[PDB]
Design a protein around this ligand. Structure first.
Ligand code: K
Ligand code: K
Ligand code: K
Ligand code: K
Ligand code: K
Ligand code: K
Ligand code: K
Ligand code: K
Ligand code: K
Ligand code: K
Ligand code: K
Ligand code: MG
Ligand code: MG
Ligand code: MG
Ligand code: MG
Ligand code: MG
Ligand code: MG
Ligand code: MG
Ligand code: MG
Ligand code: MG
Ligand code: MG
Ligand code: MG
Ligand code: MG
Ligand code: ZN
Lengths: 96, 205, 114, 82, 127, 60, 153
RNA sequence: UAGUUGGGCACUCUAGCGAGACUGCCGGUGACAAACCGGAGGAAGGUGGGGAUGACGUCAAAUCAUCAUGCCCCUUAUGACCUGGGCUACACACGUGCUACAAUGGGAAGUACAACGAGUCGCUAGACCGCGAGGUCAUGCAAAUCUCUUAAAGCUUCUCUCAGUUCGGAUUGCAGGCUGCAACUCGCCUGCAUGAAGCCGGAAUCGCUAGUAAUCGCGGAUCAGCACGCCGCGGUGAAUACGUUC
């Protein structure tokens, strides 16, 4: 089984990743990771003023930190355990 | 010279997003849904001392944490008010909405609440100096390490607009670790808009 | 010489051909490929027979006064029918959509400081 | 230019009007706002009043004019000089 | 037995491996002269051997990528110095006095908003 | 003519190309980010407020 | 600057002639950071020098530098309502800089088709104590001598 | 055939946690201070480089056209709908750029090295068609997996021989590819043809102190289509700073 986790804050992402690994390992399944993936970054530059003044800019960035988890020899209990384990709303989780 | 927004400067350093959810294909739709929800909630609970709306999304659900200094007024008797609000929000959003009220202990230390109070008094034609002075008094007694307030416009209906402010303690806007709340409110008077800006520096992080 | 135009002598054959009106560098390469003559040789070094073969290709082609008459006929056609392009040609202004507020010197001519 | 597979372009209303007048001994002026319409042999021999932004300028079609847009024969803006 | 090292210069990263030999240098499965066709850059790569008096003693295999040829040459030089450190700690003093151990941190300065380049500013007309 | 323009933009377009994007918050036609469906002004305002998830002041 | 003299960045010796001076020459002749073209031109010019003259091109180039490098320059000074030149001895750093600058500029102005040919011709003439570069040095010394009355400044 | 397959993560890399740089240590000067100069060590030394950060205020500076707003004004009209046109005009003046005037170059062939980012009806492999723009079939990828994307300067050969040219690429004619309902006003791009001014620029004036200037490409937002602009990325990569009179 493959679990891809994405979040805007690496701190909560690591918390959720540790929870996933802990529950899987407790269930007895083999776990590889967590594996950091190259964080995506996007940049948006906007004129600071509301009229003219092109030279004065401001730049905002959105970062998506991503973690990869691999479960091997997953026991039947692990599937329900991982589906029951609920992450914070700020973390996006994908399975297989 | 212009100054960065105090909250925007610290978002991602020590302040966290109020919209605590993640989405890729639904990002724009969720953002506009949040904006409509926030606007509707402000209009509906204007009288209630609402400060912060934290929105979370879990599949079709929407969890809305509303901070208030009048939780009883917001909740209503037997939760009637919150239940009616959930029905209205469900209609507006088209999906299940869980609502959680939060008590704003020490309301005097909330920038938006202090600014709203000052704006209400100005609309009632209180002396701007006295309004700001009493706001600072209450904030300091609440225990703010510092506070700063500013009112700008046609003070006392004067033809030439100007800005008058007050402060006490410490408001190190350039200190990034400093936990400084900020808010801007508008008081509508017979002569137009007056802008009320409040900075409240609490214990740093 | 070839089409009534005395192409340069020492230059290489492709370039000397380009000196003919109505023939660009790509066209010169194509005609030399058809005639089988190498492109590196100078026209002075070209033999009489190679020159005659080149002449046949060029005559098969449309160049010089023939091409000039054709293009002038097209431009005259526009001007007579009174197209927007025809009026542009008549008034010496850019015909391909350029802006005339600045630049446009190529069509307009030398600047008149008045 | 206009891709070959697409064929020409001519506004259906304008094309319909010219086709209706085809079976005519003497042609009547056709008032159009369709600058985009391409000229056709059917258009030949007619008088078309093309809108130029403020009024319908008449234009007499001919086999030389064919293959162009109507709007090109109706100048938009007037520039006499300085 | 092989002696490893890592070198970095601009965006270039070079994994260097020294093995005792004749001084042959191969980069990414191609000879040094092929990979770096600039004599100055080849001399730059060989600087560590000059300072350490180990000319021809060791052959080099470098897996390098990122950046251009000049940056990769600097990375190869840095990795070679590090590999020499592994070979003999006593070379550290000579290498340091040559500055080969120092990691050249001169990176491409970021473009600034309102400026055409890192520092170039738009042409300014007073009136 | 802001309200009329906003209503017209909301209505379905007559042709595909006619469709254009406005800042759904203020209706500004120019400089509307598809990712956020906001003008630069509203985007900067809400980003400061921290109501746009993930976005924060950039610096490097 | 106002603060004081600043550090001077160093130059490594030339790969084949093992001379910092040749590296500086490559830098001067370089354009748009095209150091490869610059170095090739310098080496071609040195080959031409060795061919047309049996002497070592490095020695010939050093001879040209000795002939072209000035000794006394003139620095303009505004004295009240009158501005005039003042003689000044040239520090060795600026001496080499001016020598290289003059050589490259006059070489680029030469009439030979290729830059390396122009550079080789200019270098050989300068070594022989003739040409535009030597003329520039003579004019600089002449100006300094003419304004020698102001040496006290 | 390929890092492919097996196998391993050691190296690189990715990204969390840490270490480190603090005048911390040493010599000298200094009013026993602050501090300054030098040295060691170290990847980095004195703010290491860069960004974000912009005090009280100033110019009734800019914005009632982002938004909001007191007052004044119009209310079958200064409101609203539609097609078309204009914002793209053009004797002229100015600003900002792009390309050039060439041999440190143009052209032909071969060969090498990046980074930042974007991708669902979107990025598109591969093949075939077309001289080309592109078209057809079709492949993988919601992506460190596939793609855009073998980057250009560079390097090696061959040719050009100082020529308003094999420099230049405007203008123009023709013939076409796309997007779109639609390319005349008024899109971009391609092929053929044509081949303008321009021979390094008066008074004057601009940017820049190092991975900087210069120069070479690449991605991106806006976006059906359309940048020499803007934002960002990396490649190559200099000269000079005596000094504070002006
Ligand atoms: K125009
Ligand atoms: K202009
Ligand atoms: K838009
Ligand atoms: K690490
Ligand atoms: K307004
Ligand atoms: K108003
Ligand atoms: K101007
Ligand atoms: K431009
Ligand atoms: K060449
Ligand atoms: K058009
Ligand atoms: K585009
Ligand atoms: Mg600008
Ligand atoms: Mg010709
Ligand atoms: Mg145009
Ligand atoms: Mg750069
Ligand atoms: Mg549009
Ligand atoms: Mg600071
Ligand atoms: Mg004004
Ligand atoms: Mg109004
Ligand atoms: Mg209209
Ligand atoms: Mg305009
Ligand atoms: Mg010339
Ligand atoms: Mg500086
Ligand atoms: Zn907006």
């Amino acid at each position: 089984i493959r679990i891809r986790l994405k979040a805007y804050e690496h701190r909560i992402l690591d918390q959720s990743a540790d929870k996933i690994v802990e529950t899987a390992k407790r269930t007895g399944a083999d776990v590889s990771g967590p594996i950091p993936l190259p964080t995506e970054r996007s940049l948006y530059t906007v004129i600071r003023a509301t009229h003219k003044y092109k030279d004065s800019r401001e730049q905002f960035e959105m970062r998506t930190h991503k973690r990869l988890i691999d479960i091997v020899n997953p026991t039947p209990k692990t599937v329900d355990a991982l589906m029951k384990l609920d992450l914070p709303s700020g973390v996006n989780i994908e399975i297989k | 010279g212009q100054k960065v927004h105090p909250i925007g400067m610290r978002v991602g350093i020590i302040r966290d997003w109020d919209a605590k959810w993640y989405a890729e294909k639904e990002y724009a739709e969720f953002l506009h849904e949040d904006l409509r929800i926030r606007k509707f909630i402000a209009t509906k609970l204007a009288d209630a001392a609402v400060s912060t709306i934290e929105i979370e999304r879990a599949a079709n659900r929407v969890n809305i944490s509303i901070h208030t200094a009048k939780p009883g007024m917001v909740i209503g008797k037997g939760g009637s008010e919150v239940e009616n609000l959930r029905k209205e929000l469900n209609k507006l959003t088209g999906k299940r909405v869980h609502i959680n009220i939060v008590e704003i202990k020490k309301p005097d230390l909330d920038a938006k609440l202090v600014g709203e109070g000052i704006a209400r008094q100005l609309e009632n034609r209180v002396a701007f100096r006295r309004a700001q002075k009493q706001a600072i008094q209450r904030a300091m007694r609440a225990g703010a390490k510092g506070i700063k307030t500013q009112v700008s416009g046609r003070l006392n209906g004067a033809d030439i607009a100007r800005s008058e402010g007050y402060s006490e303690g410490t408001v190190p806007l350039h200190t990034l670790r400093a936990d400084i709340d900020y808010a801007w409110e508008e008081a509508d008077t017979t002569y137009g808009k007056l802008g009320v800006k409040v900075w409240i520096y609490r214990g740093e992080i | 010489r070839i089409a009534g135009v005395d192409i340069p002598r020492d230059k290489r054959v492709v370039v000397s051909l380009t000196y003919i009106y109505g023939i660009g560098n790509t066209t010169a390469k194509k005609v030399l490929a058809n005639v089988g003559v190498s492109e590196d040789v100078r026209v002075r070094d070209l033999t009489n027979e190679q020159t005659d073969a080149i002449r046949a290709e060029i005559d098969k082609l449309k160049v010089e006064g023939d091409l000039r008459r054709e293009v002038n006929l097209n431009i005259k056609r526009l001007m007579e029918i009174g197209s927007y392009r025809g009026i542009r040609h008549r008034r010496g202004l850019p015909t391909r959509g350029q802006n005339t507020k600045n630049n446009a010197r190529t069509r307009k001519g030398p600047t008149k400081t008045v | 230019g206009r891709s070959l597979k697409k064929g020409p372009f001519v506004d259906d209303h304008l094309m319909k009007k010219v086709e209706a007048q085809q079976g005519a001994e003497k042609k009547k002026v056709i008032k159009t706002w369709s600058r985009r319409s391409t000229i056709f042999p059917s258009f030949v021999g007619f008088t078309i009043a093309v809108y130029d932004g403020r009024k319908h300028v008449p234009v007499y079609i001919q086999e030389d004019m064919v293959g162009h847009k109507l709007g090109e024969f109706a100048p938009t803006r007037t520039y006499r000089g300085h | 037995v092989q002696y490893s090292g890592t070198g970095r210069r601009k965006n270039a990263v070079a994994r260097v491996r020294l093995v005792p030999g004749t001084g042959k240098i191969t980069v990414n499965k191609k000879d040094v002269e092929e990979y770096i066709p600039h004599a100055d850059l080849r001399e730059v790569i060989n600087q560590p051997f000059g300072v350490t008096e180990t000319k021809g003693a060791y052959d080099v295999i470098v897996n390098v990528n990122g950046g251009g040829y000049a940056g990769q040459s600097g990375a190869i030089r840095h990795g070679i110095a590090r590999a020499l450190l592994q070979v003999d700690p006593d070379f550290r003093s000579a290498l340091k006095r040559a500055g080969l151990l120092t990691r050249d941190a001169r990176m491409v300065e970021r473009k600034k908003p309102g400026l055409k380049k890192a520092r170039k500013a738009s042409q300014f007309s007073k009136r | 003519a802001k309200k009329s323009m906003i209503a017209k933009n909301k209505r379905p377009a007559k042709h595909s190309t006619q469709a254009y994007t406005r800042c759904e918050r203020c209706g500004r036609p120019h400089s509307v980010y598809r990712k956020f469906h906001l003008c630069r002004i509203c985007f900067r305002e809400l980003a400061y407020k921290g109501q746009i998830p993930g976005v924060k002041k950039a610096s490097w | 600057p106002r603060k004081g003299p600043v550090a001077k960045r160093d130059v490594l010796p030339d790969p084949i002639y093992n001379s910092k001076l040749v590296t500086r020459l490559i830098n001067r002749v370089m354009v748009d950071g095209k150091r490869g073209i610059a170095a090739n031109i310098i080496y071609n010019s040195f080959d031409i020098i060795k061919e047309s003259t049996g002497n070592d091109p490095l020695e010939v180039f050093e001879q040209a530098m000795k002939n072209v490098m000035p000794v006394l320059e003139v620095k303009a000074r505004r004295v009240g309502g009158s501005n005039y030149q003042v003689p000044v001895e040239v520090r060795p750093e600026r001496r080499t800089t001016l020598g290289l600058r003059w050589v490259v500029n006059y070489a680029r102005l030469r009439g030979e088709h290729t830059m390396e040919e122009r550079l080789a011709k200019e270098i050989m003439d300068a070594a022989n104590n003739t040409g535009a570069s030597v003329k520039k040095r003579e004019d600089t010394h002449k100006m300094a001598d003419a304004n020698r009355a102001f040496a006290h400044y």
